[PDB]
Amino acid sequence: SGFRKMAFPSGKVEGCMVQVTCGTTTLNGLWLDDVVYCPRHVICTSEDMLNPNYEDLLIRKSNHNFLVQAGNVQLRVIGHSMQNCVLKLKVDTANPKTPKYKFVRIQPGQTFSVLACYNGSPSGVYQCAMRPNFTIKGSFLNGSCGSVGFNIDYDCVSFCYMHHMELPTGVHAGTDLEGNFYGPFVDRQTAQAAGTDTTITVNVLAWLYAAVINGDRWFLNRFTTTLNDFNLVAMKYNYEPLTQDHVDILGPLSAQTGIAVLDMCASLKELLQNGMNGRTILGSALLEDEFTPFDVVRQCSGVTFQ
Amino acid sequence: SGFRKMAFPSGKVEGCMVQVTCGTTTLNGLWLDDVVYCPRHVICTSEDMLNPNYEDLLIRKSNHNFLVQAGNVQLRVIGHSMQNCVLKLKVDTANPKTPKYKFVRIQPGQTFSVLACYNGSPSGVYQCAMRPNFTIKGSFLNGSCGSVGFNIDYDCVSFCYMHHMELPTGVHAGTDLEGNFYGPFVDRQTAQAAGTDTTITVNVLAWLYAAVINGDRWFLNRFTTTLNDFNLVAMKYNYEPLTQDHVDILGPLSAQTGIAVLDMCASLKELLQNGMNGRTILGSALLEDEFTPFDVVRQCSGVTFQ
C-alpha cells in the first residue's frame, strides 16, 4: 500500500546519453544504434538563438564540427542531417547498450519519466505530465537540453520527449524524437505564449480511485450526474471535459472499487464546488492530475520492467 | 528552473536486483560481489510471520533450499547466514555489475531513492524521506520486501534501506544493509507502535529557500526571530527542533538568496501560526519536508553522476 509519483527505472536510458558539442555550445544527445539525436540549437551561439536561420547555420557546419562524447570515449560523426528541430548525427559506432526502443508522440494528459542530464551525465529522474497546453512543468537547468522523456513497456523504451527550451515563464517545451514541437513553440529565444492550461480531469479521477484503493474515501457520496452535467461544472473550474473514451478508460478502476465512473464524477463535482475543507487526499492538499488511469493500475498492481 | 521531487538514476541498482525464493515465499534480494542480501522473513510462511522463531526456522534450511535468480540465471547458493534481520546468501558467482558501493545508516530526516521491485524486477523509482519516527511513507505491495533505498555519489552507491514490512497503519519499516531495523520495529506480524511523527524543520526551510530561488516569494515577511523563539513555536506545531548544526547546513542557501536563516525562520513561524490561506508554494498547498538542504543545492546546481 501507499501511493507515490513513481518514475520508470532509468537504467536503459542512462546508457544512451552522450554529450554533444558544437562550437562552445554543449548539450545532451541520445545515442541509439549509429545515430545521435540532439536539439538542433546545439549549432547556435547565444546570439544566434535570438533569431536563428537553422538551414544557413547548419550549412556552416561539417561532420567534423560536431564533438560527441560517450562517457570516456569520443565518437566519430560521418553524417549529419536536420529533421525538423532535431539534429541526427550518424556515428561510426552502433551503441552497444541500445535498448529496444520506439519513438512515440504522446497526447496531452499522458505521463512519462524524464531523465534530467547535464553534459551527457544523468542527474535525476522524475515523472511528468504533458500539460493540455503542451508544456511540461519540469526541472531543467542550463545544459539540460536534449534530456529525454520516456515510458517503458516491459523491455521496450518508448521515447516521447526531447527537452528544447525553457519559456520566459519558466515552464518547459520540447519535441518528439522526430523533432516536432509539442504545442505552438519554436526553437528561438523570443517571448512565446503557452495556452491557458487546464486540469487533466480523467487523471484526477484516476487519482481519486487510487485514494479509495489506499483507504481514503471521505469524498465519496451517492450523488449522480450525467457526463454533460459534470462537464458544465468542470469547464467553470478549467477542467478538461470528460468524454466517454475517458469513462471507458476508467472502467477497470470502477470495476475494482465498486464505484461507478459517474459516481466518482459526482464526488469530484462536489470537491470542486465545495472545496476540500482542511482534509488531504493521499497526503495532498490539492487534486493531483499527473497520474493517468494506466499509472494507477500499474502502481497499484505492481507491474515490472524486464 | 522548476523544482521537482527527483530520484537518483537507478541503473546501477537495477543491475543488483535478484529474486530469492524459499519454499513458497518469493522476494527481492540485492546481489553485490558474491553475496545476496535479503530479508530473513523469506524463510517464513504467512503463518510463521505471526510469531517466527528465526533461529529455529533457519536451522531447517540448507543452501539448496534457496533459489536465487538474476534475470534468467540461477545462481548457486554455497552458504547462508543471518545477520540481524537480513539473510546473507553466499553464491558461487560475483555480480559482474556490482557498482562501487557503501552500506550506510541514515539519520531521520535524510532522503533517499527507492527502487521498488517485484520478483527481482524493477517496477519504479521514487524519492523518500526517513521520517523522524523511523518509518517511511512509501509505495510497497505484496512482494516488494527486499527493495532497497540508496543515494549516489558520482559513481558510488550508498545503500541505506531494505524494505521489510508494512505496519497495520499503512506505513513502512525496514533495515539498513546490516539488518538493523530503523525504529523500534521487529519482523513479526503483530501490532507495532511508531512514534509520533514530526515535521523535518530543516528540510522545510531548505524548501522555502528553493521556492525563493524559483521566484516564489509571497511568504517572506518583515519579522525576525531567535532560534529559541522559533523552536518554542516549532514544538507546538509538531516540528522538529532547529539546531546550530541545521543553521550551519542552510548557510549556502542563505548566502545565495541573501536571506538570513533566522529571517526564513520567522517567515516559517508566520506560515505555521497563520497557515497558507489557500495559497501555494512551489505548486504545493502544504509545507514540504522531503528535501534536504543538500537535495535543494544538488537540484538547483545540476549535480550529475557517472
UniProtKB/Swiss-Prot annotation, chains A, B:
Protein origin, superkingdom: Viruses
Known catalytic reactions: TSAVLQ-|-SGFRK-NH2 and SGVTFQ-|-GKFKK the two peptides corresponding to the two self-cleavage sites of the SARS 3C-like proteinase are the two most reactive peptide substrates. The enzyme exhibits a strong preference for substrates containing Gln at P1 position and Leu at P2 position
Segments in the Cytoplasmic topological domain: 1-306
Cross-link (Glycyl lysine isopeptide (Lys-Gly) (interchain with G-Cter in ubiquitin)): 5, 90
Record note on what altering residue 205 to V does: In strain: Zeta/P.2
Active-site positions on this chain: 41, 145
Activity regulation text: Inhibited by pyridone-containing alpha-ketoamides compounds 13a and 13b. In turn, alpha-ketoamide 13b (tert-butyl (1-((S)-1-(((S)-4-(benzylamino)-3,4-dioxo-1-((S)-2-oxopyrrolidin-3-yl)butan-2-yl)amino)-3-cyclopropyl-1-oxopropan-2-yl)-2-oxo-1,2-dihydropyridin-3-yl)carbamate) inhibits SARS-CoV-2 replication in human lung cells. Inhibited ex vivo by michael acceptor inhibitor N3. Inhibited ex vivo by compound 11a and 11b.
Peptidase C30 domain residues: 1-306
Effect annotated for changing residue 132 to H: In strain: Omicron/BA.1, Omicron/BA.2, Omicron/BA.2.12.1, Omicron/BA.2.75, Omicron/BA.4, Omicron/BA.5, Omicron/BQ.1.1, Omicron/XBB.1.5, Omicron/EG.5.1
Subcellular locations according to the entry: Host cytoplasm; Host Golgi apparatus; Host nucleus
Main function: Cleaves the C-terminus of replicase polyprotein at 11 sites. Recognizes substrates containing the core sequence [ILMVF]-Q-|-[SGACN]. Cleaves and inactivates human TRMT1, preventing tRNA guanine(26)-dimethylation of tRNAs. May cleave human NLRP1 in lung epithelial cells, thereby activating the NLRP1 inflammasome pathway. May cleave human GSDMD, triggering alternative GSDME-mediated epithelial cell death upon activation of the NLRP1 inflammasome, which may enhance the release interleukins 1B, 6, 16 and 18. Also able to bind an ADP-ribose-1''-phosphate (ADRP).
Oligomer and partners: 3CL-PRO exists as monomer and homodimer. Only the homodimer shows catalytic activity. Interacts with host FBXO22; this interaction promotes the proteasomal degradation of nsp5.
Name of this protein: 3C-like proteinase nsp5
Gene (UniProt): rep
Full-protein positions shown: 3264 to 3569 of 7096
